[PDB]
Design a protein around this ligand. Structure first.
Ligand SMILES: Nc1nc(O)c2nc(CNc3ccc(C(=O)O)cc3)cnc2n1
Ligand SMILES: Nc1nc(O)c2nc(CNc3ccc(C(=O)O)cc3)cnc2n1
Ligand SMILES: Nc1nc(O)c2nc(CNc3ccc(C(=O)O)cc3)cnc2n1
Ligand SMILES: Nc1nc(O)c2nc(CNc3ccc(C(=O)O)cc3)cnc2n1
Ligand SMILES: [Cl-]
Ligand SMILES: [Cl-]
Ligand code: NA
Ligand code: NA
Ligand code: NA
Lengths: 269, 277, 270, 275
């Protein structure tokens, strides 16, 4: 699985194999490895760069505090490292300033639903990741697995179409089924069903991004706290790439990179 | 047997329990949401071929107790009702709690109204009385009740009392007895019952049947079956059939189901067994 | 029969509905303001002799004023009497200081809506009464009774869920429909409807508290001033207990206690 | 009237036979498995309301007719939640020394061992923990039921229990911390129906050993066999066995049915002591 994106300067970047996107959360309230200051975030960035990350995803999600956290990190990373920078936000103002500070792409868990977001991404000309997120509160397990998958695909296609209409280029759109529980509105079996059926998303023609890293589904199946979820998480990434995923979002860059290389070879014989 | 008197005074006689097939047309609906008109019609066609007596169409977007949503509900319902009215002979039921949806659905061809909230919303009683259609009154779904907070016996008594009051509310409003159907409201979640309470109501269904009106029961694919079998909704067919069988064995008049043919065949055996008394 | 768990983890069981006597220590308080410490203690003494299970003390710069009225009373009561003490307040700081002084539980008419209230009660580990308080923009009578009731239950459920999420133990939550007119945003018939439907609150699975004592809906129905509302008030207490209420908040301890004893017996004989 | 000494050296006195309610948190149990913390707590609340003196929490699946971490994950949360809520004594039904330590550390007041501290380290663990312990008679090996006379079987049971008691005293376990139990049951409890009834009829012989005696017939197969009833229908027969056990001097009754048992044994106690 190879793919490309067109950056905001119309420069084409080609990935010869699935990309690894390392996570740097600067929100003290994150479930895993919150970064409370700039120095600690930069220590993580350096490790991830050493471990071979392709992209670093910086998130800190009330707008000014988000900016005070994100901007210093993006600036420092842009200054020090050659990695592509993704900003994980749903706020148009954050997108604008993040990109002005050096972010190359926008990762939106809300798929540009927040007013002004769509036009903002079109105006910035950056690649964007559209993650599937419930219209509103969904009851997990309330439909068959098949019909749930149908709705996720349908809604992602609608998001893609909104992007194209707003003038976002086809080579700037990444999609993500939005793996997780809690407000991601899925139970464990639904998450695994979407993973099993990932080729149906891949067949939509855009690069697919997948993030299982240390999440509750692994915790539930293994009965392990987040710190003990490494091996289970690696397994999900392997399966995601085996099924055609283009980008893996992870807290564990080296382990993911090595594991998915095996998935790629298995898939590519 | 039982009959329903339609708004034009024609009496539909049912010599055996009726099977009401379900077509949910809201995105947040249970089991199988129909996301467009064509998909809704494919299901109707299947259910018609499987021998449905009634097709129950519902597309509620939001709870009216908590307009744009009214119009959204209409936009989803009317095209399906209209297409079915033109194509098929089946009776059409509209599952809604909104008086305006009731009026427009009936004008479009709906024969009866199915209200989970028992016409409690402002103007619902008067609306149904004026429409002169049969109506199903369900045990009101209490989102705040803590299941198990009373004993099975007392909970059963409270369900019976509430249904008796809903019947009286209807009669006082000028809704005729031959257009009233009652339903103990099987389900968990917002239906304010746990697994054991649901099974207790099912075992005690004859107590609802003795109230003298046709009783409707809907277990199809619901969480009670999932919890007992440890299965997702697509794997609850055989458990659901069993509940329909027992409901009919105990005297239920109408079964509301996602699986028409299977329900129809199974309850025929329940009906025969019940009949040999 | 119900129970609560105090902040020391001690299980308190009530073999029958508890009577909570009211001691208001603010000058603008309802029915009988206690203008000094001595008067408050005389009332406490009477209510203890009359069989009160709990004493609810309430006195709502202004925080400090509330404390100077409350603490001396709570302190005196804590030293002299074995009854449980409740503090009627919405202010986190008053909650902390009152509990530190001897209050066993917190009674919040605002259901811990005031910032820091939730975290404060969770840390204090005391039981808390959550009363429903309709939006102050509400106009009584502008919705049907049934509709209004659903919104009251829904909002109480949301308050309960906030408490649980904040780590407040289920055996430390009491709920209250918030009987009253005026700023309680209800009219006479809405109050009687909630009373008639009280078993629907009991069905939420937590002890229910009710307070009709001397209130305006009795005054309006009987055309009586506060002094003449005793017989109507106990009638409301009787009905509340008959419908399953666990705690009755009253200015008239002896009369309420005796009346609800009859209600409890009648309810109990299934 | 009997007494026990808790590990805090405080003596607890029972003026009448104590009722021990059963809370099993294992998925595979023949009667009322508790599969989650909440169900276990509901049962506990009900049993406390009904007047239970002791709650016996077990995480080992009990089917007589057919990992340490898994037992702890089921038990500890329940024991913790009970310790924080109720004044009742907490018993932990386990044979695993590690479980004994962790359960006691979490709040268990005594240890109920169906193996009478046979597993290595169990003896020394209980002596060091300083908690009361119930020693239940269990087949040293696979016994064939009905293979000896009733009298000779009883002799072996009494001899083996006496050996167990002696092992405990030698290990330094206090005499006011030892409870004994004839181990009523079939299957791997190594007895048939007649043998169980013989032991019950002869309960006074265990009572004469000078330690409080615990007895557990609740909804067991002996009742099922005699009445031809599934577990749900064994209440009345179970009550009868409890009545006889108490009439013969049992100090503790282990039951799934607290209120019914308490009421029945009050009658037994009245009759026994009217003298
Ligand atoms: N594109 C994209 N894709 C994701 O998967 C993602 N996940 C998070 C993290 N959000 C969650 C959700 C659920 C859970 C749990 O159940 O454990 C954990 C973390 C943040 N940004 C994200 N962005
Ligand atoms: N007359 C009537 N009778 C019903 O039984 C019914 N059920 C639904 C569907 N509602 C539910 C409720 C609970 C559950 C669960 O626990 O799984 C599922 C679906 C919609 N209209 C209904 N109408
Ligand atoms: N938990 C609880 N429950 C109450 O019922 C209550 N009432 C008051 C007193 N408030 C009112 C409200 C209305 C009226 C009237 O209309 O007469 C009188 C007094 C103060 N704290 C209270 N706390
Ligand atoms: N002290 C003590 N005393 C018991 O009697 C006991 N029983 C069990 C449960 N074990 C059984 C054995 C046999 C049977 C049957 O034949 O039905 C049923 C249950 C677990 N802990 C126990 N602990
Ligand atoms: Cl449905
Ligand atoms: Cl007052
Ligand atoms: Na791939
Ligand atoms: Na409805
Ligand atoms: Na009519």
């Amino acid at each position: 699985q190879s793919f490309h994106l067109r950056l905001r300067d119309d420069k084409r970047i080609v990935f010869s194999e699935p990309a690894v996107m390392g996570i740097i959360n600067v929100s003290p309230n994150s479930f895993y490895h919150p970064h409370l200051d700039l120095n600690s975030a930069l220590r993580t960035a350096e490790k991830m760069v050493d471990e071979g990350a392709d992209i670093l995803d910086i998130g800190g999600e009330s707008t000014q505090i988000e900016l005070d956290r994100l901007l210093p990190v993006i600036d420092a990373i842009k200054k020090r490292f050659p990695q592509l920078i993704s900003v994980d936000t749903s706020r148009p103002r954050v997108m604008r300033e993040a990109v002005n500070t050096g972010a190359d792409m926008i990762n939106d868990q809300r798929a540009l639903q927040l007013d002004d977001a769509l036009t903002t991404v079109s105006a910035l000309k950056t690649p964007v990741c559209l993650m599937h997120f419930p219209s509103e509160t969904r009851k997990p397990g309330s439909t068959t697995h098949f019909y749930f998958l149908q709705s996720v695909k349908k809604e992602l296609q609608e998001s893609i179409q909104r992007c194209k209409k707003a003038g976002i280029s086809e080579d700037r759109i990444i999609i993500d089924p939005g793996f997780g529980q809690g407000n991601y509105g899925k139970n464990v079996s639904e998450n695994f069903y979407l993973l099993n059926k990932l080729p149906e998303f891949v067949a939509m023609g855009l690069p697919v991004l997948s993030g299982w890293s240390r999440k509750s589904m692994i915790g539930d199946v293994l009965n392990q706290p987040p710190e003990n979820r490494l091996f289970g998480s690696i397994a999900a990434d392997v399966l995601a790439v085996y099924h055609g995923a283009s980008i893996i979002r992870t807290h564990d860059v080296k382990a993911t990179r090595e594991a998915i290389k095996i998935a790629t070879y298995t898939r590519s014989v």
